[PDB]
Structures are given as C-alpha cells and as structure tokens.
C-alpha cells in the first residue's frame, strides 16, 4: 500500500470513503495484498442489490449508477475534520471493513469494533479464513454485518460487495433521516478560531437554511447513486442559494452540479444543462453534445474559485484552507487528465473516474489545455500559506503536484516539489514510522 501517492479525482466527492483494518493475525505483506486485491470491485452496478423500503434512497429506482468506493487504510485524526461535516458530508468514513483471520467469535469482535469506532454508521467484517468451523458457518450466516471469503479475497467477493451496498445504504438512509432537522451551521461558526481561514500570500434565514438543506440532500443523493435526482436537487439548491446572496455554500453547490456532469457523461445519458448554471456561469437549455464539456467545467471551477475567494472577508462564514486547497488539487488533476488526449473521448473520462494513469502516452497535437495553462494553474498552490496545516494534509499537496509535474514532463520542477516534501517531512515534532514509500521516494529523488 502507498501513503504519499495521492492524486484526487474530480469525482472524489462522489466516492464513498471506507476504512479497512487488519482484524486478527495478519502480516504486512499479506494484508497489503489482500486489501489491494479487494480494491478492484468498487464499480458495482445498482441493478443487483435488493430494494430498500424507503423511496428516497431505493436502489430499484435508477437502473444505472455505479456507487463508487474509496478504500483508505490511514485513519486520519478526528477533532478537526469534525467541524466541516455539516458543510459537506462526503468527508467522514461511512463504513469500516474488518478483514479477520483468527476463527474468533463474530459477535464480540463486532461489538468491540463499534466500541473503538463509535461515530461510524455501519461496521461490518469479512472472514478471510481458510475453511472455518461448520459451527461458525451458521453463526456468520445468520448475521448480516458478517461475511466469509477464502484467503486473499476470491471466494464470493461479488456477492459480498453486493450485500455491503444495501447494508450501509439503509444505515445512510437512517443517518440522513436523523440529519434532516439540523440548522446546518457554517464550518467557521462551528469550529470558531480552530480552522485556518485560507490565508493568501498572493426571509434571510429560512430561505438560506432551506437552500442549504436541499444542497446536502442533493449531495447525499449523489453519494448514494441517484444522479439525475441529484442534479434536479442541485438546480433548486443553487438557484435559491444564489438568490439569498450566500457565497460559501454556493461554491460547494456549484461544485456538486459540476461533478454531476462528469458522471452523467460517464453513464452516457442525454441531459440538458439547467438554465440557472448557464446564467451564473457564461457558456462562452442546450444539450450537452452541442457544447464543449471540459471548457464548460473549467469555467464552472473558475466561478467556484471566484466565490470561495469572495467569501474570505466574512468573520465566521469563510472557506477553510482545507476545502480551498483540495479543490485546487482536484481541478488541477482534472486539467492534467484532460491534457492527455486529442479530444474528450471516453478513454480520458474512464481514466479520471477510475483512478488509473497509464502515464507517458504519445502526446497529441493541440490538447484541450495546453502545457502553460496547467502550469499557471498549478502555481496557485504556492499562493497560500502551506506551512501551517497538519503534515498529513501538507504532504498531499506536494505529492500530487509532483505527480502533476511528472505527467507534464517537468522533471526539474518535480525534483523541486519533492525536495519541499522531504523538507516538510523532516520538520515535524511527531515521530513517524518507517514505510517503504519513503524508500521509493528517496530512490526517485
């Protein structure tokens, strides 16, 4: 597994973050192989899970959809990201996966699992054990949060990943149902003087709460898999929230409706762009085929960045540095993905959605974004004070910018940013455990 090899995709908010942990008597290499082989079935169609009772999040109301997953192993520290959950819910891990090989009792294991991770929505674990006891077979069969698989995850992985979908989707439904009544304070209002306010180095209430509620409803719809409904929610959430003269949340609403277009093209569905997004963002209403998509999304991202910048002078409704920097990286990776193909074919869309590079392809002539606009955009990362955030996030910027420069063929700038990465890594009071990623990094430098 790799720790300093981040490269966020433009459709990252659509991903469902999942934590995976080595229950029992695993070893490093074997567990790495197990999780790596497990991270190959994150494209499960919605047309194979049994329906859920409620109508909002029912799988059996949209035959298409993919319901992505994002397998992460590093447990990011809480108590700082907790504030910016009301702002957008695609941060918190929604499911834990236990890979257990010890022939232990599932009930107590699951109980302690939820004890150690109380803030989670739905824990569940898979028994990667070689021929467990037949007495344990019925015990695992009767309970829904527990599954069984052969060593290195090849027995019934399709059915397991089919069942987990509904298993956490019902819990997500319960979460949203308990969550729809909250007043939805801005992250600055929640955290106070605890989150950096993106230091650069370059009927007014109910009409606002209603728009914010619709925005998060659409965001949850996007997370679940209902894409057309998510867009039909974002149109209301963005028009009402632009009428009320609110900038911070409007940026995220415009973000979400921008992400919806990527996946709608990925599924291959015909859809008309809404009127309102055209009004608040010039084309420079109309079917997507009769309008260039990547340049439209570049303009939408520029407008989002404009609103984020315009939302800095407010004392408590400011954009955190984390959201700003990750959006910059997100759009930068979108730019680099666009700069690998002569046209916006399905190959580049699959590459950006599925997180696969296939680097050093034959360069075409006249790409979408030429190789100066991308560098000009990437320079914007240095425009903000990097050396104040936590090291965990700080290495993300340097690593993904190194990847960007490597893709662009700017090896010398890759050396520069990697040197900055090492300087940051060395300068930290907290000690760090050894990992082969550092070995590969030094080898590359």
């Amino acid at each position: 597994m790799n720790i300093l090899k981040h490269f966020p995709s433009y459709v990252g908010p659509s991903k469902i973050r999942t934590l995976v942990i080595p229950i029992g008597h695993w070893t490093r290499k074997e567990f790495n192989n197990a999780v790596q082989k497990l991270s190959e079935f994150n494209e499960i169609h919605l047309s194979d899970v049994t329906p859920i009772d409620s109508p909002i999040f029912t799988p059996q109301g949209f035959p298409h959809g993919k319901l992505f997953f994002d397998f992460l192993t590093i447990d990011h520290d809480d108590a700082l990201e907790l504030f910016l959950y009301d702002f957008e819910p695609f941060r918190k891990t929604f499911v834990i996966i236990g890979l257990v090989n010890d022939y232990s009792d599932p009930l107590t294991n699951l109980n302690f699992m939820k004890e150690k991770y109380p803030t989670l929505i739905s824990p569940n674990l898979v028994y990667a054990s070689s021929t467990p006891t037949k007495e344990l077979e019925q015990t695992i069969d009767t309970m829904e949060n527990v599954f069984a698989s052969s060593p290195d995850m090849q027995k019934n992985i399709e059915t397991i990943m089919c069942d987990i979908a509904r298993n956490f989707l019902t819990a997500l439904n319960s979460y949203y149902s308990s969550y729809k009544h909250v007043t939805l304070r801005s992250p600055g209002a929640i955290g106070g003087n605890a989150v950096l306010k993106t230091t650069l180095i370059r009927n007014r209430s109910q009409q606002k709460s209603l728009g914010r509620q619709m925005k998060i409803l659409g965001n949850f719809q996007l997370l679940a898999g209902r894409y057309v409904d998510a867009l039909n929610s974002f149109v209301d959430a963005i028009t009402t929230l632009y009428k009320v003269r609110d900038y911070l949340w409007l940026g995220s609403a415009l973000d979400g409706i921008s992400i919806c277009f990527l996946l709608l093209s990925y599924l291959g569905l015909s859809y008309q762009i809404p009127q309102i997004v055209s009004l608040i963002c010039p084309v420079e209403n109309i079917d997507v085929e009769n309008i260039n998509l990547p340049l439209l999304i570049k303009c939408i991202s520029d407008k989002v960045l404009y609103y984020y910048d315009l939302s800095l002078m407010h004392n408590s409704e400011y954009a955190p540095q984390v959201v700003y920097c990750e959006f910059l990286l997100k759009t930068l990776t979108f730019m680099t993905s666009c700069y690998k193909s002569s046209e916006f074919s399905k190959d580049v869309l699959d590459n950006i959605v599925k997180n696969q590079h296939r680097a050093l392809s034959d360069i075409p002539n006249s790409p979408m974004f030429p190789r100066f606009e991308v560098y000009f955009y990437s320079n914007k990362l240095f425009e903000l004070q990097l050396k104040e955030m936590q090291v965990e996030a700080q290495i993300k910027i340097y690593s993904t910018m190194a990847e960007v420069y490597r893709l662009l063929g700017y090896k010398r700038k890759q050396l520069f940013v990697l040197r900055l990465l090492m300087v940051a890594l060395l300068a930290t009071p907290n000690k760090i455990a050894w990992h082969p990623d550092y070995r590969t990094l030094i080898d590359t430098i």
Binding site: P22, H25, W26, R28, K29, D75, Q390, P429, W434
Partner: peptide
Amino acid sequence: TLDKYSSEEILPSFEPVYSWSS
C-alpha cells in the same frame, strides 16, 4: 534487512496499518 524483517511482522489488530499524527 529492515525491509525483509518489517515485511513479515505481525500487525496489531484493531488499528490502522499506518498513522500520521501522534
């Protein structure tokens, strides 16, 4: 070596493989 030794140790259960903060 260190790679050949840490590549077959026993990870603690109920914990992430890697952690960043102290």
